[PDB]
Amino acid sequence: PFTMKYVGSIDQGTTSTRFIIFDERQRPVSVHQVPHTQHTPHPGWLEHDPMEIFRSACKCMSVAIAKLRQKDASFRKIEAIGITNQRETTVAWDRVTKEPLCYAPVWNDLRTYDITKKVTAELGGGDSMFASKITGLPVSTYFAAFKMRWMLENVPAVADACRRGTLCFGTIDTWLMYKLSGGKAFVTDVTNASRTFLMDLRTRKWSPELCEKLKIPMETLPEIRSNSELFGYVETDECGVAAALNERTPIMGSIGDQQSALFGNMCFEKGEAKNTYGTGCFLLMNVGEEARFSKHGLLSTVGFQVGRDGPCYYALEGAIACAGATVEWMRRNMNLFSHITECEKLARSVPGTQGIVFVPAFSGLLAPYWDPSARGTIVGMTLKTTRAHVIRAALQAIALQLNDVVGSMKRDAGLNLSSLRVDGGLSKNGLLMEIQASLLGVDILVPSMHETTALGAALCAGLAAGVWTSLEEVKAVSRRENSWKTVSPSGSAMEREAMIAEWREALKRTKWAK
């Protein structure tokens, strides 16, 4: 009643794993990180060693716990652990060995492209969105199923293991939850399952039409649950993890990374949305207790579900391929600046782009204009154009794509974006947040506790273990402890429209590949 309580969050990302311990204030009190290897066997491919990820996670936990006890020597244990992960990335493993059959292809890996084609033809009958009402997703290389298929066709040990009745497939939550539990648990959560291309969105249940249609035995699928409930206990002793925890610790949170950030930024109400700037962008809008579908090629997905049959919130999702990457490309590919802060400083040093548009579509346009053909392009240059204008044009362009994305989401959902919370690194660029607010015409909230993705999973775990009692208590503790900078709109109807008309014309000149 006096001693502080803690919730652990495993944040398993594309390039590294972290364990963050939160206290009752929603403050990260201990953190450790461990990187894992980005295997690229052929151009366009990306693979991860699933045992390197498991071990990173256990290493992360034992180090973080150790540091925390130095800080609080009166702390016996963590209340619960939550998991949040890079989604779609699929592991295949043996039921008896408990070892992975092969490396895990990663959300953005392109090896499944041919399979993607075979699927669209032979099934959808050339319609990518054929199963969309069922799943929320267009046929794409990203989704699990198509990676499960590739492994079954192209990996000897995976094909064998299926016929023998020992094959377990799983997203990273599932893989982590399996190993952490000693092989005792085989579960996934609704957000992660919404990405398999094997789940029915409205019902949040596996679809026999698809597994069978896609030739994937149901036996290789884990049980689905909500994001906030008992999944299992931590029982493994890898890197002395169970001993560092002291008492058995339940895993009571599981949620995909983009949804975890929605939840960790308190986007509990429809119309609440978040954008995460990293190498790219991922914009998610909470749309309410009923699913919505897209006439603009956006993804329909689960936002969150707190508790077994607690209400389930749904969301729309969009993305931009190069955000941070564009900023870094200007630095390390083009020499336009050296120190990070020069980017903002140079773009502020000019009053606008004065003619030029820079469409930074280095790997094509996604969002509501799928076009793999589009490449990086600059138009309207004169001898007056400088690096300052080009940098400012890159930042405007990011904001312009997100404007387009939100325009679509509004119509596809028929709602107003009440506000946008942002996080990512690129959220540290004040000019970008200003441009973004003017174009969307809503407040942009920049939280100063910048561990919001990892907080999502801790909130799910802590809600189930009774650290926090309700979303209201969650919101209220957040207000008291974790401040945010708020960036309001400040444009003109005519300027906005002039930027957009100019941008629209530039887009027409970007088709290049093939």
Ligand X SMILES: Nc1ncnc2c1ncn2[C@@H]1O[C@H](COP(=O)(O)OP(=O)(O)O)[C@@H](O)[C@H]1O
Nearer to ligand G3P, 201 or 343 (CB): 201
Instruction: Tell me the window of 102-110, 300-308, 373-381, 424-432 that interacts with ligand X (CB under 6 A).
Output: 424-432
Contact with ligand X (CB under 6 A) among 71, 98, 205, 295: 71
Q: Is 141 in the site for ligand G3P (CB under 6 A)?
A: no
Among 217, 240, 307, 376, binds a copy of itself (CB under 8 A): 376
CA neighbor of 147 nearest in space, from 176, 107, 178, 181: 107
235 marked among binding-site residues: no
Element spanning 160, H or E: helix 156-163
Regarding 278 and contact with Mg ion (CB under 5 A), the answer is yes
Q: Does 383 bind a copy of itself (CB under 8 A)?
A: yes
Amino acid identity, position 249: T
Query: In 3D, which of 349, 318, 344, 502 has the Cα closest to residue 432?
Result: 344
Tokens of 305: 């579900």
Task: Please pick, from the candidates 57, 343, 388, 463, the single residue that binds ligand X as defined by CB under 6 A.
Answer: 343
- Quote the CA–CA distance of 316 and 82 in Å, as a whole number: 23
Interaction between residue 72 and ligand X (CB under 6 A) = yes
Q: Which CB, 243 or 334, lies closer to a copy of itself?
A: 334
Cβ proximity to Mg ion, 192 vs 258, nearer residue: 258
**Strand ranges inside 257-324, DSSP E:** 272-277, 281-288, 299-305, 312-320
Round to whole Å and give the CA distance between 296 and 370: 9
Strand blocks (E) in 42-198 = 47-48, 80-85, 90-94, 104-105, 167-171, 187-189
Which stretch, 83-91, 225-233, 242-250, 378-386, contacts a copy of itself (CB under 8 A)?
378-386
Stretch in the footprint of ligand G3P (CB under 6 A) among 16-24, 82-90, 201-209, 433-441? 82-90
Does residue number 110 form part of the binding site for a copy of itself (CB under 8 A)?
A: no
Span of 58-66, 81-89, 456-464, 491-499 interacting with ligand G3P by CB under 6 A: 81-89
Cα 389 to the center of its chain, rounded Å: 31
Question: Which of ligand G3P, a copy of itself, Mg ion, none is residue 130 near (CB under 5 to 8 Å by kind)?
Answer: none
Q: Which CA distances in Å does 376 have to 251, 326, 506?
A: 44, 10, 11
Q: Determine the Cα angle at 261 with ends 258 and 263, to 5°.
A: 115
Q: Does 328 bind ligand X (CB under 6 A)?
A: yes
272 binds, among Mg ion, ligand G3P, ligand X, none (CB under 5 to 8 A by kind): none
Cα 483 from chain centre? 23
> What's the CA gap between 309 and 319, in Å, rounded?
29
- Judged by CB under 6 A, how many residues of this single chain contact ligand X? 19
217 binds, among a copy of itself, ligand G3P, ligand X, none (CB under 5 to 8 A by kind): none
Q: Which is nearer to ligand G3P, 30 or 194 (CB)?
A: 194
The one segment of 146-154, 232-240, 282-290, 381-389 that binds a copy of itself by CB under 8 A: 381-389
Q: Which residues contact 80 (CB under 8 A, 6 or more apart)?
A: 7, 8, 249, 250, 251, 252, 253, 461, 462, 464, 465, 467
Cα diameter, the chain: 70
Q: Which of 203, 217, 218 is nearest to 134 (CA)?
A: 203
Shortest Å distance, C-beta 280 to Mg ion: 5
Residues 19-38 that bind ligand X (CB under 6 A): 23, 27, 29
Residue ranges in 47-66 that form contacts with ligand X under rule CB under 6 A: none
> Which neighbouring-strand residues pair with 12?
17, 85
Closest approach, Cβ 258 to ligand X, in A, equals: 10
- Give a three-class secondary structure readout of 197-232: CCEECCCCEECHHHHHHCCCCHHHCCEEECCEEEEE
69 binds ligand X (CB under 6 A): no
Residue of 210, 242, 336, 367 that binds a copy of itself (CB under 8 A): 336
Instruction: List contacts with a copy of itself (CB under 8 A).
Output: 322, 325, 329, 333-336, 355, 362-363, 375-383, 385-387, 390, 509-510, 512-513
Write out the residues near ligand G3P by the rule CB under 6 A: 86-88, 107, 142, 257-258, 319
Binding residues for ADP: 14-16, 23, 25, 27, 258, 279, 425, 480-481
**Chain residues in the site for ligand X (CB under 6 A):** 4, 23, 27, 29, 71-72, 276, 278-279, 324, 327-328, 340, 343, 424-426, 428-429
